[PDB]
Amino acid sequence: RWATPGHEERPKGYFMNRTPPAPGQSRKWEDWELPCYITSFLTIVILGVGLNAKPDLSIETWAHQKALERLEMEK
Amino acid sequence: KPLSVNDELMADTVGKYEALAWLSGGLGFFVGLGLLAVLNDKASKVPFTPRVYPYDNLRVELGGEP
Amino acid sequence: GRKKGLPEFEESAPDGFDPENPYKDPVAMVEMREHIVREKWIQIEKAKILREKVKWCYRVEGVNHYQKCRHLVQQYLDSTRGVGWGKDHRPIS
Amino acid sequence: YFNLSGLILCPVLGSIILLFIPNSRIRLIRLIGLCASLITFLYSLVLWIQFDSSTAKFQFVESLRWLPYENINFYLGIDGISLFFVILTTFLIPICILVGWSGMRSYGKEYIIAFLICEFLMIAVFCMLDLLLFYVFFESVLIPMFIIIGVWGSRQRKIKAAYQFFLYTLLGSLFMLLAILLILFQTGTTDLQILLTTEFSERRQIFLWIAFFASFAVKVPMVPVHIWLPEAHVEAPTAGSVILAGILLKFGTYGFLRFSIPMFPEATLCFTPFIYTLSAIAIIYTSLTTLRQIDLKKIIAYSSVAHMNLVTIGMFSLNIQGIGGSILLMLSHGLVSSALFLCVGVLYDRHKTRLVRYYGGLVSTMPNFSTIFFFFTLANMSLPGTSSFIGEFLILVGAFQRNSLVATLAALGMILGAAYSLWLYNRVVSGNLKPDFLHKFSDLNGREVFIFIPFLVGLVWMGVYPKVFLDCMHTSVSNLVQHGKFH
Amino acid sequence: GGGMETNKNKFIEDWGSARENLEHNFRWTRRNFALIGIFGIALPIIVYKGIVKDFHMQDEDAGRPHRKFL
Amino acid sequence: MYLLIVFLPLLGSSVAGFFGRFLGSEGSAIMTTTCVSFSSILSLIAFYEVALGASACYLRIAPWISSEMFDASWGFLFDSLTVVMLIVVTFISSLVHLYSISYMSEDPHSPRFMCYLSIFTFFMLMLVTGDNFLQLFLGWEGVGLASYLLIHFWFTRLQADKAAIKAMLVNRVGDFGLALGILGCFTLFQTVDFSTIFACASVPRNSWIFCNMRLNAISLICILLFIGAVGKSAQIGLHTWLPDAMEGPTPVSALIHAATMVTAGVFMIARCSPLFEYSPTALIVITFAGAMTSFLAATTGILQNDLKRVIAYSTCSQLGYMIFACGISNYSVSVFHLMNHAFFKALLFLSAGSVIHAMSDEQDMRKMGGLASSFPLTYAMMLIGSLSLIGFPFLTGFYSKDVILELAYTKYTISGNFAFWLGSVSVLFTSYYSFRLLFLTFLVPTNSFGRDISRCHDAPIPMAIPLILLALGSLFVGYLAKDMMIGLGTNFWANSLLVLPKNEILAESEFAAPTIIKLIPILFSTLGAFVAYNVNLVADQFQRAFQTSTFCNRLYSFFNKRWFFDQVLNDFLVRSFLRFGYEVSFEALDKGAIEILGPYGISYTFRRLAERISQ
Amino acid sequence: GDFRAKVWSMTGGPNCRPKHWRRNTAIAMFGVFLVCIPIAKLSAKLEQRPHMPVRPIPSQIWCKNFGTKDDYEKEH
Amino acid sequence: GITYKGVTVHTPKTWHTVTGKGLCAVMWFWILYRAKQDGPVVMGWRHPWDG
Numbered sequence A: 001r002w003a004t005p006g007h008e009e010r011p012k013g014y015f016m017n018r019t020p021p022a023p024g025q026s027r028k029w030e031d032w033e034l035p036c037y038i039t040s041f042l043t044i045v046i047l048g049v050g051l052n053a054k055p056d057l058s059i060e061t062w063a064h065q066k067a068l069e070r071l072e073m074e075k
Numbered sequence B: 001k002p003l004s005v006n007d008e009l010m011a012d013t014v015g016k017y018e019a020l021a022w023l024s025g026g027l028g029f030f031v032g033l034g035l036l037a038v039l040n041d042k043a044s045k046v047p048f049t050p051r052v053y054p055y056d057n058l059r060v061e062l063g064g065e066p
Numbered sequence C: 001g002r003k004k005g006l007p008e009f010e011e012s013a014p015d016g017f018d019p020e021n022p023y024k025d026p027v028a029m030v031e032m033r034e035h036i037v038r039e040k041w042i043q044i045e046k047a048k049i050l051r052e053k054v055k056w057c058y059r060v061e062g063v064n065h066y067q068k069c070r071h072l073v074q075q076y077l078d079s080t081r082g083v084g085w086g087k088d089h090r091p092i093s
Numbered sequence D: 001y002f003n004l005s006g007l008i009l010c011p012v013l014g015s016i017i018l019l020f021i022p023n024s025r026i027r028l029i030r031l032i033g034l035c036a037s038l039i040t041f042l043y044s045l046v047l048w049i050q051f052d053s054s055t056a057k058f059q060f061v062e063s064l065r066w067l068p069y070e071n072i073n074f075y076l077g078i079d080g081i082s083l084f085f086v087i088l089t090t091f092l093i094p095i096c097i098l099v100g101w102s103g104m105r106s107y108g109k110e111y112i113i114a115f116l117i118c119e120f121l122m123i124a125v126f127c128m129l130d131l132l133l134f135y136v137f138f139e140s141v142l143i144p145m146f147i148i149i150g151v152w153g154s155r156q157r158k159i160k161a162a163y164q165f166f167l168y169t170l171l172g173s174l175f176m177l178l179a180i181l182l183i184l185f186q187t188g189t190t191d192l193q194i195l196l197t198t199e200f201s202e203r204r205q206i207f208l209w210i211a212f213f214a215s216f217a218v219k220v221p222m223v224p225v226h227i228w229l230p231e232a233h234v235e236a237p238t239a240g241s242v243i244l245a246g247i248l249l250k251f252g253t254y255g256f257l258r259f260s261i262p263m264f265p266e267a268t269l270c271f272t273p274f275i276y277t278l279s280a281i282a283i284i285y286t287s288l289t290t291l292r293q294i295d296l297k298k299i300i301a302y303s304s305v306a307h308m309n310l311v312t313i314g315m316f317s318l319n320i321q322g323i324g325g326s327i328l329l330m331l332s333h334g335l336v337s338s339a340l341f342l343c344v345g346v347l348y349d350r351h352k353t354r355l356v357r358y359y360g361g362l363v364s365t366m367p368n369f370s371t372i373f374f375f376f377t378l379a380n381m382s383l384p385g386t387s388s389f390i391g392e393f394l395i396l397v398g399a400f401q402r403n404s405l406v407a408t409l410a411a412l413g414m415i416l417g418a419a420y421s422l423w424l425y426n427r428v429v430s431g432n433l434k435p436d437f438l439h440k441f442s443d444l445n446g447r448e449v450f451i452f453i454p455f456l457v458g459l460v461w462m463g464v465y466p467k468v469f470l471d472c473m474h475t476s477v478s479n480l481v482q483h484g485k486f487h
Numbered sequence E: 001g002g003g004m005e006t007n008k009n010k011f012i013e014d015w016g017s018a019r020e021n022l023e024h025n026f027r028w029t030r031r032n033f034a035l036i037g038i039f040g041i042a043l044p045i046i047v048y049k050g051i052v053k054d055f056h057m058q059d060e061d062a063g064r065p066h067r068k069f070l
Numbered sequence F: 001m002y003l004l005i006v007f008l009p010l011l012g013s014s015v016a017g018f019f020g021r022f023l024g025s026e027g028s029a030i031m032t033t034t035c036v037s038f039s040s041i042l043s044l045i046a047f048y049e050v051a052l053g054a055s056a057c058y059l060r061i062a063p064w065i066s067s068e069m070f071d072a073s074w075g076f077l078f079d080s081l082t083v084v085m086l087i088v089v090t091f092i093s094s095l096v097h098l099y100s101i102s103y104m105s106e107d108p109h110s111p112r113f114m115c116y117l118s119i120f121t122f123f124m125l126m127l128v129t130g131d132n133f134l135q136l137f138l139g140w141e142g143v144g145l146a147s148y149l150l151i152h153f154w155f156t157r158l159q160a161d162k163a164a165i166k167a168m169l170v171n172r173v174g175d176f177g178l179a180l181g182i183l184g185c186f187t188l189f190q191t192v193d194f195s196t197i198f199a200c201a202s203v204p205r206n207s208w209i210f211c212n213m214r215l216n217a218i219s220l221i222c223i224l225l226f227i228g229a230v231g232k233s234a235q236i237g238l239h240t241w242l243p244d245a246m247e248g249p250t251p252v253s254a255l256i257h258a259a260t261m262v263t264a265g266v267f268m269i270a271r272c273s274p275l276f277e278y279s280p281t282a283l284i285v286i287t288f289a290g291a292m293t294s295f296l297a298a299t300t301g302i303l304q305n306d307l308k309r310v311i312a313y314s315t316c317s318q319l320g321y322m323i324f325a326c327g328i329s330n331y332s333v334s335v336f337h338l339m340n341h342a343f344f345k346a347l348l349f350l351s352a353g354s355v356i357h358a359m360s361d362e363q364d365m366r367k368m369g370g371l372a373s374s375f376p377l378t379y380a381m382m383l384i385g386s387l388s389l390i391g392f393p394f395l396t397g398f399y400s401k402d403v404i405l406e407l408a409y410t411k412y413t414i415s416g417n418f419a420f421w422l423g424s425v426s427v428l429f430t431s432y433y434s435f436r437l438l439f440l441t442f443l444v445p446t447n448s449f450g451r452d453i454s455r456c457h458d459a460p461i462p463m464a465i466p467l468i469l470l471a472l473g474s475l476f477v478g479y480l481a482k483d484m485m486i487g488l489g490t491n492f493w494a495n496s497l498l499v500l501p502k503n504e505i506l507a508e509s510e511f512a513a514p515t516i517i518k519l520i521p522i523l524f525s526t527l528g529a530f531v532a533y534n535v536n537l538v539a540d541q542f543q544r545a546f547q548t549s550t551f552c553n554r555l556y557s558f559f560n561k562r563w564f565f566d567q568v569l570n571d572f573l574v575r576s577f578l579r580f581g582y583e584v585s586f587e588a589l590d591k592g593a594i595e596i597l598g599p600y601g602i603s604y605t606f607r608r609l610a611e612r613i614s615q
Numbered sequence G: 001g002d003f004r005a006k007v008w009s010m011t012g013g014p015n016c017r018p019k020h021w022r023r024n025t026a027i028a029m030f031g032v033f034l035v036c037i038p039i040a041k042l043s044a045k046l047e048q049r050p051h052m053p054v055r056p057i058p059s060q061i062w063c064k065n066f067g068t069k070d071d072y073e074k075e076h
Numbered sequence H: 001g002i003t004y005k006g007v008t009v010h011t012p013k014t015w016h017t018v019t020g021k022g023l024c025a026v027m028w029f030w031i032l033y034r035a036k037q038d039g040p041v042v043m044g045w046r047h048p049w050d051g
């Protein structure tokens, strides 16, 4: 049971229910795939590189360093 | 065979009210046992005095005024 | 192009605002509202710092936290009465 | 420099370009519409990046004269409250375009044009800081939605549903317009920043508040007027329902947040028990009526009324947990609910039916759909790690601090919400197959897999780290909590 | 049978149509009158009284006078 | 090293469920078993380091929810209490994973079963290692979701789906109670973290306005939390889901319902002990509910004939015992009995599943008998488990149940007497049905069929290693851990458990009572064993009384049908709510009443009005 | 059956058994090992031990936050 | 495998019988050994060293 090679050469059913293309060829992309993929790449780039690089401007940060300052001036 | 209007929600030896009476009796067993426990009054039959701790019942170590 | 660093806010009550008739100078009203929000957030963060102090007093001390963190716990609970937009206990700022 | 002008002009250019393109060029129409929607979405995402989160002043303000004496003018501006609404209403449009990708040959150019005009009108609604023009773009959405419901409806019922929706919206709209006119005559202008610094006599607060509530409560169906929503929602295309539930249901709550909770702080307090009473019974009644529905799209449509009435409990609590946590629920609802209608749209496109009786055992024939459907079932039933739980719990802690009883009644909403949400999934997905009724199946294609991806990512990202969204709003929602208060 | 569309049944379709065309099925009997006058007229009043009294008791506990919720 | 303890099951599940098509039925088993086993060994080092080394670790990753002060970060808290639950949960999960390799050898969808088991283990680890009330809630509801998914793992069945949905509804009421309790916690202390709440749990002495009532702030919160504990632990109020939840696979019963997720309520009560200690009113409720649950499960489990269902009522009784052991404000004994039971009940479920699987999935004790010679190993293992369960002297079940009973005796109060009486009678009932299960399945003359006996095969290696490990545990672990957990003045718990000096009765439990009280459980167990033998092995079978006495038949039906809970509760709540959904809310409120006064019911008189304009 | 061999599922389907599950199993371990390294490195950095251990524990090899929070009066 | 009347009973392997007997014997020996050590204590005949 734990040594015999399996019978299913390839997983049952095609992925996204699409037949594999002709041999020596490639899956021709639809008219929407390229714009959607460049959009999804630019979204990740902008969010990862923009949100992590924008300054930490917030009311939970300025107020934190103002309270941490007035909390010690009381002594 | 037209379907029923309420065709979306569909212990045979007992009825709902008879089984409710049986359940009420079963829970009244617990209630009566609780009343018997009250009637026993085990609080007045404790064989030892309440435990007394030093340093005024550990007032300081329990958050009391220093 | 904002300058690099934390935001800078003038910490002073906007002159010209009088609580007798608040709806007199509209600009002083919005400035006063922003200012009051800022000190309420300052109070909130001070309460949060006291909460952190209590949190690490409970863990470092252990069983003895009842006598060692009493001083901090009462300060934190005194500082959480006038937090802000919370329970009906509202600060008279 | 990205401002509100370009974001609004992009759908204009998109709709104009397709207006003068021959209908025989079906490919070009779809490509240009999708490209315009994606460009608008990227523009909104960029506008998020440069959004200051330390000032309560409106940002990216733009002005355009309307009356000759500048009494009323086009004032466009966004704050921490309406920024995410703009992002969501620009993100939902490309999904709606992609929904009708295969069958677009029959709809024609009038489909993308209608949706782009819709996007144009909804972007300006969340950006207007003028009370009158907010009404003008508030009720300009009827024409594109009327056309969408009628022209591309499913059955002959489309005439009745469109009439009913139009009539209800009109009766709310004009009763609001009278109040807007009375405010304009008394104050002098209609600028929001000026109307928020004008003292209203106590007698006029109740009348104006009631008149505003009449129009808003229709678009956030409270109790007496949630009978147009089910019919108009079921008699709508798959992408049409996404717009109606995703955005059109967010006008009422946004209208309350922007023009009611601040312009009348005294009137809001007096009517707080009234809103709590309506919302508490709406949560109980609607989440219970959902159990005895048999239509797939009429069950999820009843899952929005309970969720949207849970939002109005949060807004009227008037604290950071309540108001701040109610915004996350609408962003979560705008993603969870609109994703559920995509799942129903997937089932309807293949098998032209919506009765739950015909569906069963899809777990063995459509496994990718079952996995995706189950995930949004969990989100709809307020599971932790999902964006719905963060909003749902923050509203409860915001209302318990004000009234323990209303937080108790609203807590039974998740008891009933988890009842039908899983019970629907058991019927549709789990169980045995019924080859007598339907026998041919096809799991999710490339579009459906890709379409659900931003919903999957955007639902857990908000569900495990909602600090990204929360920290952008606290400066803006805290100034909203107190307006008449000075202590 | 080369079609994905369901083989709809007359009984199920008619049952669903009847369950969706219930708008025109009132007779205005005493059962409907009592039902809409109790579970639609009294429960909202009971709930509203509940919240109003909860606010009143919160107000009296702090010593502040009752708030005019009208 | 401590993040690996929590996230190895998550990674194993995420691999075996997303890429199971490349690993098959063997690679998917290997991934989850290896990941959970590595988490188990890491929990062993965690026990050597935190519990024995007395150095707790506190780990915060990132803030989760950050309102003005509603801070519930992604924090993990490993103290003495947490580590015990770790070494229990993860070890039992690894043994169940190893058991399911051979149990799910012919089932087609084995990889999804193992993915579900791993995700359940991950959720339980998030539950036990929770620093906040929200991460605890996250695990508390993820564990319910995982149990629901695993109960109807065979989605084709209808009874499995009904049991799963009933379990979800009951756990949802429990979650509502827990959510109300958490909301109460934040309203008082303005925090959900355990450290701050437990530090400031003594100062508040105020009263709230809750649902038109003026109650005590701490007492209300404790009662609301106990409602959630009742929902998850299957106590007197909400327990019907547990017996019905046996429709799932046997490894689901052994892990999901025996060792873990039923002890979640007990663990939450024990962890929140620095808060429950200041609400004496809640402790009375806890004691009463635990005693009622123990007695009721003991009475219900004596007449069941299904092999799996008898053990479920044993689990319910043990959980009731733990609950009212917590109610006497002795949480060390509760956790000790929890850890003890998680051994000899997992062993019982695994051995019962080994019997069932070899018997062609025959679950009725009326159709098995004389299996002792055929199944030597499994008979011995079930003997060990049953002897531990009944509380045989000098065994794992003797060092905890006897202590609980003698502690209940010395709690000289009204609530303590009730718990002592019910827990004393429940010992006799537990002995009776445990020995009946042992007798009918193994020692009575054969009542099975020829085909079942012909196709017999004892447990192979993957189903025998977890059994043997659990047998060694149920033999020695109770004695080994007796001193550290329920010893006098032990500092093993450190600050994990708080017991106030006033309500400390552990010392008097040992030398303040007659020796008869310390021997009552043994005498009652012997009486129950004798009764079971005399009614099963040799008897005239006077069952003719059940055929001639109307009361006897109804009495037999009462105990068999779960005290008429499922029938009565269904008709009077579920059916009533189903009618409340359609016959009123959909039929009258919004059907035509709004329509008739709306835009077309009577507003269509404009047709009868516009046409009259010709006048 | 006959049609369940034409359905693609992430889990693999009924009685799934690929020809090269041994090689795939070895890769999956290595992938899990590679993603577990940063988690272990992250855990050893953010973990805090207020109390010195009774005996030398293995976590002192990598963790360095031992007896650091003893001055809780200056916590943020 | 022994057939009496058609039906046959497969004899268990040596590993199972040996393991079961060994575990049962270990349990019995442990119970008796514990009864030797602290058996009088639970009977109340003698405290450990209390008195």
Ligand SMILES: CCCCCCCCCCCCCCCCCC(=O)O[C@@H](COC(=O)CCCCCCCCCCCCCCC)COP(=O)(O)OCC[N+](C)(C)C
Pocket: D363, D364, D365, D366, D367, D368, D370, D371, D374, D375, D378, D383, D384, D385, D386, F013, F014, F016, F017, F018, F109, F112, F115, F119, F142, G004, G007, G009, G010, G011, G012, G013, G014
């Ligand atoms: C969101 C926070 C909580 C997350 C909880 C996750 C719990 C799992 C949720 C999804 C479980 C799947 C349930 C819906 C699908 C029902 C079963 C199904 O069809 O799924 C497929 C697909 O397999 C799966 O179930 C994949 C989904 C689960 C694996 C992915 C989970 C990854 C870990 C959980 C998420 C990680 C973070 C969790 C903590 C936030 C399996 O099919 P088969 O077992 O092969 O049998 C079907 C018969 N036939 C082949 C003929 C079609």
Ligand SMILES: CCCCCCCCCCCCCCCCCCCC(=O)O[C@H](COC(=O)CCCCCCCCCCCCCC)COP(=O)(O)OCCN
Pocket: A043, A044, A047, A048, A051, A052, A053, A056, D087, D088, D091, D453, D454, D456, D457, D458, D460, D461, D464, D465, D467, D468
């Ligand atoms: C193939 C998929 C198959 C199914 C997969 C299921 C889901 C798996 C993936 C889960 C989602 C992962 C998302 C990350 C969640 C955890 C990390 C939170 C993000 C984070 O902490 O970083 C913040 C944002 O940066 C960032 O990293 C932002 C980048 C995130 C990009 C997400 C793009 C989603 C697109 C949704 C569009 C619609 C949006 C909703 C309107 C900055 O942190 P900070 O604020 O503290 O800054 C501190 C500066 N000193």
